[PDB]
Design a protein around this ligand. Structure first.
Ligand SMILES: C[C@](O)(COc1ccc(F)cc1)C(=O)Nc1ccc([N+](=O)[O-])c(C(F)(F)F)c1
Length: 238
């Protein structure tokens, strides 16, 4: 039942709308990453709200958890796409936004991209199954909370516990759980690096001709600084 649901709600293809028939430029690449982010956010929200037990969460905590975990969720899914679609040879942000090393360099996000490429390879090295991927991705949504607590922390704690239980079941073991939790933990530092880069870019957006969509700008200026300032922190296993 649980896996039936995760499979059923898994987002379909999302395109960036990038113009690949034009020479690469920092401005165009980042405007496309931003637009792609705005597009993926719409899908992540619909996905999250259809997850088993998500409605157990207080209304206010629902959108907050989604926004805090957004980058991590996107990174994990992109890593999986890169692995399944191009065997980690390139970063598959979208069918029309695939990054080779030149674009990784041009985007000024090289270090972050190489780490995501490594993440992509780990899906292969660790032989992560599509089902482990689905359960791990859902667990990522419940892996970052505010120090001052959510409106109802208890409902969040129960939900997170239940998703870990589902991972236990899919695994069924100790060695596998160790591998998967280590992989999950590795997503956080990458998201942090992207958060920092994105935050800095928004602040100087008017100087580099980069366009930020409405929702992205709000999340970056309101929620991301809470993470960067330590008010909102990831829940690591290790
Ligand atoms: C620079 C930026 O546009 C910022 O996007 C944000 C994404 C989430 C967030 F909370 C704040 C900003 C970006 O990183 N976009 C982006 C677009 C797509 C994907 N993707 O499809 O996985 C990613 C990725 F997660 F890889 F890094 C990143």
């Amino acid at each position: 039942i649980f896996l039936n649901v995760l499979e059923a709600i898994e987002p379909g293809v999302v395109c960036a709308g990038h113009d690949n028939n034009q020479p690469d430029s920092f401005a165009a690449l980042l405007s496309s990453l931003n637009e792609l982010g705005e597009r993926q956010l719409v899908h992540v929200v619909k996905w999250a709200k259809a997850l088993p037990g998500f409605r157990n969460l207080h209304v206010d905590d629902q959108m907050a958890v989604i926004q805090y975990s957004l980058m991590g969720l996107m990174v994990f899914a992109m890593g999986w796409r890169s692995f399944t679609n191009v065997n980690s040879r390139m970063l598959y942000f979208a069918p029309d936004l695939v990054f080779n090393e030149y674009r990784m360099h041009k985007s000024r996000m090289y270090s972050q991209c190489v780490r995501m490429r490594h993440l992509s390879q780990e899906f292969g090295w660790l032989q992560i199954t599509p089902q482990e991927f689905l359960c791990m991705k859902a667990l990522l949504l419940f892996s970052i909370i505010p120090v001052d607590g959510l409106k109802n922390q208890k409902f969040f704690d129960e939900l997170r516990m239940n998703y870990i239980k589902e991972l236990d079941r899919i695994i069924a073991c100790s060695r596998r759980f160790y591998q998967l939790t280590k992989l999950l933990d590795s997503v956080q530092p990458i998201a942090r690096e992207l958060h920092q880069f994105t935050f800095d870019l928004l602040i100087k957006s008017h100087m580099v001709s980069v366009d930020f969509p409405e929702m992205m700008a709000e999340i970056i200026s309101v929620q991301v600084p809470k993470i960067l300032s330590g008010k909102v922190k990831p829940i690591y296993f290790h």
